[PDB]
From a paper:
Hence, this loss of critical proteins has the potential to compromise ER proteostasis and generate cellular stress. This challenge to normal metabolism is overcome by the activity of the cytosolic coatomer protein I (COPI) polymer, whose repeating unit is the coatomer, a 560 kDa complex of seven distinct gene products (α-, β-, β′-, γ-, δ-, ε-, and ζ-COPI)25–31. Overall, the coatomer functions to retrieve the escaped “client” proteins, such as type I membrane proteins, from cis-Golgi back to ER by retrograde trafficking. In particular, the S protein – a type I membrane protein – is delivered to the ERGIC from both the ER (by anterograde trafficking) and the Golgi (by retrograde trafficking)3,10–12. Here we utilize recombinant SARS-CoV-2 S proteins and tail peptides, including constructs with enhanced mimicry of the coatomer binding motif (clientized S protein), to elucidate the atomic structure of the S-coatomer interface.
To determine an atomic-level understanding of S-coatomer interactions, we attempted co-crystallization of αWD40 with either wild-type (1267Gly-Val-Lys-Leu-His-Tyr-Thr1273) or clientized (1267Gly-Val-Lys-Leu-His-Tyr-Glu1273) S tail heptapeptides. However, in our co-crystallization experiments, contacts between symmetry-related αWD40 molecules occluded the binding site and no S tail peptide density was observed. Hence, we subsequently adopted a previously described strategy of using β‘WD40 for co-crystallization of peptides containing the Lys-x-His-x-xCT motif 61, which was also used for structural investigations of S tail peptides, recently during the revision of this manuscript. The β‘WD40 co-crystal structures with the wild-type and clientized Thr127Glu S heptapeptides were determined to a resolution of 1.4 Å. Overall, these two crystal structures reveal substantial similarity (Cα RMSD = 0.2 Å). The S tail heptapeptides are intercalated between two stacked β‘WD40 domains. The S tail extended motif makes contact with the binding site residues in one of the two β‘WD40 domains whereas the upstream tail residues interact with the other β‘WD40 domain, but at the face distal from the binding site. The major difference is that whereas only the main chain carboxylate of wild-type Thr1273 interacts with basic Lys17 on the β‘WD40 surface, both the side chain and main chain carboxylate groups of the clientized Glu1273 residue form extensive interactions with a β’WD40 basic cluster of Arg15, Lys17, and Arg272. A Thr1273 in wild-type S shows no side-chain interactions with the basic cluster. Overall, the two heptapeptides occupy the canonical WD40 binding site, which provides electrostatic complementarity to the dibasic motif residues, Lys1269 and His1271. C The β‘WD40 surface provides electrostatic complementarity to the S dibasic motif and the C-terminus.
Author numbering:
A (entry chain A): 1 to 301
B (entry chain C): 302 to 307
């Protein structure tokens, strides 16, 4: 595939902190600093549903398509779940005594992870009345990002301002390992490469770097430099051999995942970039990113 | 102070 980037749909809004694609409907969820969340059909450019969830920032939001839900987490410390077909608020609970930074949904089991400024990751089971099933303790600063290993989702990674990534096993109380990233301003984001040929993870930092890691040896494979302010995220695209990052410098960058050289820098004109999603099935090679002044959905080729 | 307040 040749990079042939086309704007599918962009709209302005208050600052977009969380973003996610629905796997079967042509929908994107955005969660805003204002407490509002929006679901857009990016093919028809019509709003599916929107909710004023809270007056505090909503930093995290994901679809749970197999239950017809969205799950959101906000600076009022609460996790809320809504049925996107009816609008029903399914559950509303205090999850942590501090801000929620990140939510991840297990691909097959009824588990959600939340990472918080309270220094923990918590595991919630929606088949057990959203019970707290485990708290993962060990980090020493805000937990900014949680992600399951898609190839072994009995494990997951947490990225933390304490400058480490910890990889954990469900049901065990200490990390399988702690990765010292050398990203001395902390880790804002962690993501897994999805395919079985490389055991890779990627981290993004306020220190302006993105680092690729072999999680079997713990070695740094590569450091990607070029962003000029905090790097909010960096991810492997699920189908294309590229990495996509975004920054408070207002740019998205696309990097070759083999040579680690930048291939494209985009300034979509929405000021600082905060969040990313990739369409899981590679439908049209869609990506979406949220910014200070709205969001954009792009087809990469 | 809250770091990463924005």
């Amino acid at each position: 595939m040749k990079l042939d980037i086309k704007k599918t749909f962009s709209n302005r809004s208050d600052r977009v902190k969380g973003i996610d694609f629905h796997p079967t409907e042509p929908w994107v969820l955005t969660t805003l600093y204002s407490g509002r969340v929006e679901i857009w059909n990016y093919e028809t450019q019509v709003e599916v549903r929107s909710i004023q969830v809270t007056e505090t920032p909503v930093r995290a939001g994901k679809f749970i398509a197999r239950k017809n839900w969205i799950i959101v987490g906000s600076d009022d410390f609460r996790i809320r779940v809504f049925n996107y077909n009816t609008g029903e608020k399914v559950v509303d609970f205090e999850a942590h005594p501090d801000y929620i930074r990140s939510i991840a949904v297990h691909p097959t089991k009824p588990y959600v992870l939340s990472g918080s400024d309270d220094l923990t990751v918590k595991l919630w089971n929606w088949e057990n009345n959203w019970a707290l099933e485990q708290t993962f303790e060990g980090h020493e600063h805000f937990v900014m990002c949680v992600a399951f290993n898609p190839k072994d989702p009995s494990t997951f990674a947490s990225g933390c301002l304490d400058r480490t990534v910890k990889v954990w096993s469900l049901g065990q109380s200490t990390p399988n390992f702690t990765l010292t990233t050398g990203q001395e301003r902390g880790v804002n984001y962690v993501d897994y490469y999805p395919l079985p040929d490389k055991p890779y993870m990627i981290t993004a930092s306020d220190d302006l770097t993105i680092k690729i890691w072999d999680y079997q040896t713990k070695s740094c494979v590569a450091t990607l430099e070029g962003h000029m302010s905090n790097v909010s995220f960096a991810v492997f695209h699920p189908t294309l051999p590229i990495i996509i990052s975004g920054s408070e410098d207002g740019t998205l960058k696309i990097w070759n995942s083999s040579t680690y050289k930048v291939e494209k820098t985009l300034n979509v004109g929405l000021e600082r970039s905060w969040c990313i999603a990739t369409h899981p099935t590679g439908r049209k090679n869609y990506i979406a990113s949220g910014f200070d002044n709205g969001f954009t959905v792009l087809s990469l080729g | 102070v809250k770091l990463h307040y924005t």
